[PDB]
């Protein structure tokens with residue numbers, strides 16, 4: 001394998017984002033000119049906050065990801081005080097950004113982008129890994145406009161966690177548990193948000209949001225594409241074992257077979273050219 005890389009091999013640039021225990025900075029490797037998104041974490045802050053298991057799990061899960069719709073971990077290293085993860089750089093940023101720019105997606109884009117996510121989850125769940133905090137802010141877009149799902153610091157590899165309020169599944173609020181269906185629930189929310197322009201469960205604070213979630217309290221606007229609406233209702237189901245896509249419902253075949261995906265060719269999605277937004 002190559003020599004361990006170090007800080008001096010890069011020319012760090014702008015900050016792409018900040019997390020609670022980390023900072024992601026765009027860096028260009030001097031010897032190759034390649035751009036990487038480097039996640040930086042302070043060893044002391046992690047130990048003081050008892051996050052070692054979390055950072056470790058994050059690195060282990062990312063090291064197993066080998067698919068075009070997911071972030072790729074190219075390398076890691078550390079100096080006396082910090083940990084460095086070398087990640088693939090998704091130049092176009094958050095999907096949420098596009099959602100806001102154009103308000104909402106027409107049908108061709110909703111279908112294309114939902115298909116990529118479904119295809120990514122099928123690959124993720126096939127390795128027995130669950131994200132647990134899937135959302136438009138975590139789904140990035142590469143230079144070609146294909147998705148790049150990242151942020152695995154909250155993943156579970158087949159109850160100690162609750163992601164973003166608006167995307168939390170009901171089982172998480174009434175059992176502290178979570179599984180593949182939790183991601184499918186988040187998927188439903190995301191599909192609803194692509195078509196409507198906003199997530200299904202909204203309210204003044206988290207308590208009120210959690211309240212609507214457990215009572216399955218949301219509704220579709222008049223325009224909502226019929227087939228997408230049907231898919232969403234089969235995803236936003238209170239009983240986790242009744243969601244289209246889960247093992248009890250027989251997996252991904254039935255989900256990918258949904259009428260909404262009728263015209264979709266699942267086989268080579270990352271080869272296809274994305275519809276313009």
Ligand SMILES: CN[C@@H]1C[C@H]2O[C@@](C)([C@@H]1OC)n1c3ccccc3c3c4c(c5c6ccccc6n2c5c31)C(=O)N[C@@H]4O
Nearest residue numbers: 016017018024037071087088089090091093137138150151
């Ligand atoms: C809430 N959105 C943030 C957007 C911004 O910073 C964050 C922290 C968040 O992306 C999920 N962020 C991460 C968090 C955890 C792991 C990896 C990343 C990451 C990558 C990237 C980016 C990024 C690229 C372009 C604009 C904003 C970006 N942000 C990130 C990243 C990236 O390109 N590769 C890493 O996966």
